[PDB]
Symmetry: D2
Subunit: 236 residues, 4 copies
């Protein structure tokens, strides 16, 4: 049946079906630390992609793929606040971190402009919204749908819980071009949701790579960006 379906209940150090870029890696406890967690802390940018590209749309038949993904993640800050955030994304097949990318752009963008050549769709869990540094951001931690730009086309207030596990379910229904983000914290019932219209055929190439990215722009306001598990399915 379905074109593709994979599931990681846990990660293993030096997992061969995951492409690690930047500081991303998996600890001995089995968690994907997309951002570096080290004794003397430090600035960091990392991305982790599934090793095989996925056909998101077909130019022959014109068909677009519907997909669903689920993952659990933890963002633990030392103080009461941290930077910069985590993102789930779709980019051109075997994409590399752009030259001159920063933590605030999650290793996804070279700048704050909206270039159609970026060919990136991402769901961000943005923890830093400082106005002189991230002027494009709203005045609160948020969940945003990014389409070719770090300046989200739509955002929603994210009630982040320090050190608590968040369960996320993202669905893309091709026939209606609807992208829905479902987030909940089992520990206390906190839930956030956001949906937006996005035509994948219009933004991305036929073959894409999916994964996570994140960054810590200021070592003094450190936080982790750990993903505990990951499920993904797609079908044309």
């Amino acid at each position: 049946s379905d074109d593709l379906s994979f599931n990681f209940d846990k990660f293993v150090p030096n997992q061969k079906n995951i492409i690690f870029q930047g500081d991303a890696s998996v600890s001995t406890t089995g968690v994907l630390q997309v951002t570096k967690v080290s004794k003397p802390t430090t600035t960091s940018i990392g991305r982790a992609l599934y090793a095989a590209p996925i056909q998101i749309w077909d130019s022959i038949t014109g068909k677009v793929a519907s997909f669903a993904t689920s993952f659990s993640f933890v963002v633990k800050a030392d103080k009461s606040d941290g930077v910069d955030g985590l993102a789930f994304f779709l980019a051109p097949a075997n994409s590399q971190i752009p030259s001159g990318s920063s933590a605030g752009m999650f290793g996804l963008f070279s700048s704050s402009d909206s270039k159609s050549s970026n060919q990136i769709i991402a769901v961000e869990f943005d923890t830093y919204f400082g106005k002189a540094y991230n002027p494009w951001d709203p005045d609160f931690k948020h969940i945003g749908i990014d389409v070719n730009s770090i300046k989200s086309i739509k955002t929603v207030k994210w009630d982040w819980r320090n050190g608590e596990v968040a369960d996320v379910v993202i669905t893309y229904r091709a026939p209606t071009k609807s992208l829905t983000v479902c987030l909940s914290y089992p520990s206390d019932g906190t839930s956030n949701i956001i949906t937006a219209s996005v035509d994948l055929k219009a933004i991305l190439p036929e073959w894409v790579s999916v994964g996570f990215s994140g960054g810590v722009g200021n070592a003094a306001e450190f936080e982790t960006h750990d993903v505990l598990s990951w499920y993904f399915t797609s079908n044309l």
Copy 2:
């Protein structure tokens, strides 16, 4: 792998793998009308269950099942308002509509009391909250998590859209006992979400039947309760 998984992209008149109770039926256009839609309007109560019971928990091993379900539905009211609502539920294997049930109880309850003998867990999409007849309801249309009672243990404001298709994803994660309801309207981006803790092993018997139920208590304030598609998976 997984214990059970079924998918209905559409329904067919007199579908043999669906048990119809009350006024529930599937039209020639392939939609499950859990509530009766007729030239001259009338009061109605209906339920539709998947024909085979599902083991939600094992008494031998003590294991509890995790499940996920997705469905799209439409509630179209003649005037600007309608009654009474729709519900997705889990009940004892091959459960029948209780004697003396009403539209306001969605054919799930005999009364407004919280009896542990009911053994019912349901997610309701309640359109009628009139304090004269439904005193247990909040002052707005809502999504509620019902556990052995029509008086929800938790509700959230439901931004119902007249005649628009709503996509719903319900997930139950056994290890954390977390039940999450994710609703969105692709037509305009409206999204509602709610999460609650529920121990299935404590409320339901080992074998249950899953399905939809609904009711129209006042023909003068008529509305449809149509489910367009349905996906379901469970695993112990």
Copy 3:
């Protein structure tokens, strides 16, 4: 995606999603004994509780399906009767009046009536010409279409008390039905394929399951299925 997909790694006593007919039941050890184990003559069938749409009359589409199961046939002596079968019958079908162990509770007679609407894969242990004149001269795997007299058979190298793994696939576009049997204990393998048009034999809605029989208490054997996987898609 796929219309239906279920999996039983083990069975549980009085499983609610299985319809038991005749002497079929599940033991406390979690195995489906389609035939009664205790001794006496027996006939039993076990069906999945929900019907399955095998073909659509609107679109004309036919469903492709795959199933996998493991079973054991343990005889007391060096031989036993009568066999086990995997089948597709009309939705919520009952055991026919006057059925016998040699017909696995699937047929009223040895005639080929199109009204039977039955397709079955049999693992036939008894081929005595006295009671089963339609059978070949050896234990076999047969593809039955509306009759106990198989349209095609193949020698079955049955192993007493050993677990057999079976994979049955039906590829609708080519109308091909393949039966794949193997004994992990010693490598013994048997295979058979035949052309069958489901749309021509069965109604839109069918019930799937197992059936079996022990026609002679003196030549007793079990007909136990240990696990079961099934998928179908239109």
Copy 4:
């Protein structure tokens, strides 16, 4: 649920999730020609692997994976006979064609010795058994289970049909270490089967790449080695 599951109903020219080695490629008609079809004909060796490695066993837990795969293929010879054959295999992650490999070794082996360092398990559909060049082969076209050597640990007569489509189902049940090969020709009912005991944990590394390989050692006895579709699943 399941670790991995992919399905190709057809192939597309320059498919990004398939690694092509040697002469392997996919035609405009959507078929994977692991061997070159040029006419002007020529000698050829080709391999096609799924782009992402698969974890076949875990050294931490000791668990071994069970897997199932299905594919349809055609071997069309110009004359009444052709060479050399096709193979489905599991090799070390991102394995390359060995230096000095030949068509009779399907681009899998450097020699006819049984080296444990080869770390290869393959199911071959061998069309050439000439004792002059393939002395290790039996006296008929066959299906063989290869474990670290081109000299099969077990074979069975293969009733090859020129130009007809063959459906193959290969299952590996970890608990019993049983590998079963199920082949059938829908056109005439011809069926062949073979099973053998193989401990994956003992032969292969934790991470492996799966795919097809084939060869045409003599351009004068040309034949195609086309795979039409491919399904694969694995679970630890």
